[PDB]
Design a protein around this ligand. Structure first.
Ligand SMILES: C=CCN(Cc1ccccc1C(=O)NCC1CCCCC1)Cc1ccc2c(c1C(=O)O)OC[C@H](CCC(=O)O)O2
Ligand SMILES: C=CCN(Cc1ccccc1C(=O)NCC1CCCCC1)Cc1ccc2c(c1C(=O)O)OC[C@H](CCC(=O)O)O2
Ligand SMILES: [Cl-]
Ligand SMILES: [Cl-]
Lengths: 149, 149
């Protein structure tokens, strides 16, 4: 549970926003990339796993599941690479809702930056700090600290 | 002190490696940039503060302390921007040691990637996971979780 992350790819302004969600907390990291490639996804996972104890990643699609560069990143970083099949149908809905929420926040901040990447990082900040009560940022730290102890 | 970070700028291969250190744990985030501008520093702080509860940042030099773009990022993200004067002389030594350690790790991984940015992220991973026995990644989570509780 503490180590499980899900990848998610959404599109805006002709660009791709790649998101990793910590399943148990709803905490996210995200970046803007010109297109989803194996190299972009691999580099993103490398960053993520240096920052959080990433044990398992549910990949966002079959191309990233297949990608030897993504497999190489997962090997390097000690991540178990898994598929992202929603065996629990509620999983689809959760990711869909999150993409809608993120896009809403990006709209609310869009005029506070020229570049989409800046707006996306503002959206990450707002998402992670939002109290729903604890924030996703608080939940992830508590979950992982409990695991360590 | 759970919320205190220090910026650090070091150079390699004609590029700049910008580092943020969580003082209490030694945990780091880092990125490669072409040069250390206010905008680059502002964007880096924006990313950091969306990911960790950044209360205070000791800036790495007077130019980043002065920069209105850096001040704007700190305002946006709710960060108290401070100078980085080593009133405690041991502070210089610690940062210098860390830069030396990071460069050593980058050397050890350098042939496992074409691009410096990839090597730097490998180095971040190795640094944060190294047991010294807890790792910096464990220490930061424990410190922050204790603060929330
Ligand atoms: C003088 C700065 C240029 N921008 C001025 C701006 C333009 C339009 C609207 C508002 C603002 C504005 O001042 N917003 C307030 C405020 C600025 C700090 C962050 C919190 C919000 C903002 C900015 C800063 C760093 C970036 C940006 C951008 C961008 O406009 O997107 O883009 C990506 C770039 C990547 C790093 C690199 O390449 O250096 O870092
Ligand atoms: C076919 C991939 C190209 N590289 C092949 C390579 C080249 C030379 C030596 C070893 C290896 C090698 O296979 N290493 C093993 C393994 C793969 C990387 C993760 C762990 C280590 C690796 C790589 C991947 C993603 C990147 C990279 C790089 C790079 O070479 O630096 O550079 C930045 C780029 C930014 C995102 C974007 O721009 O897409 O993401
Ligand atoms: Cl947070
Ligand atoms: Cl870690």
């Amino acid at each position: 549970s503490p180590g499980i992350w899900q990848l998610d790819c959404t599109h805006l302004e002709g660009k791709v926003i790649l998101v990793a969600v910590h399943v148990a907390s709803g905490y996210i990291e995200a970046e803007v990339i010109p297109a989803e490639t194996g190299q972009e996804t691999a580099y993103f996972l490398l960053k993520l796993a240096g920052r959080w104890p990433v044990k398992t990643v549910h990949t966002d699609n079959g191309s990233n599941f297949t990608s030897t560069t993504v497999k190489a990143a997962c090997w390097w970083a000690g991540i178990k690479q898994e598929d992202g099949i929603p065996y629990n149908p509620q999983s689809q809905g959760v990711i869909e809702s999150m993409n809608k929420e993120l896009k809403k926040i990006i709209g609310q901040v869009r005029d506070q930056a020229e570049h989409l990447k800046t707006a996306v990082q503002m959206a990450v900040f707002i998402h992670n700090h939002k109290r729903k009560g604890y924030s996703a940022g608080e939940r992830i730290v508590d979950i992982i600290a409990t695991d360590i102890q």
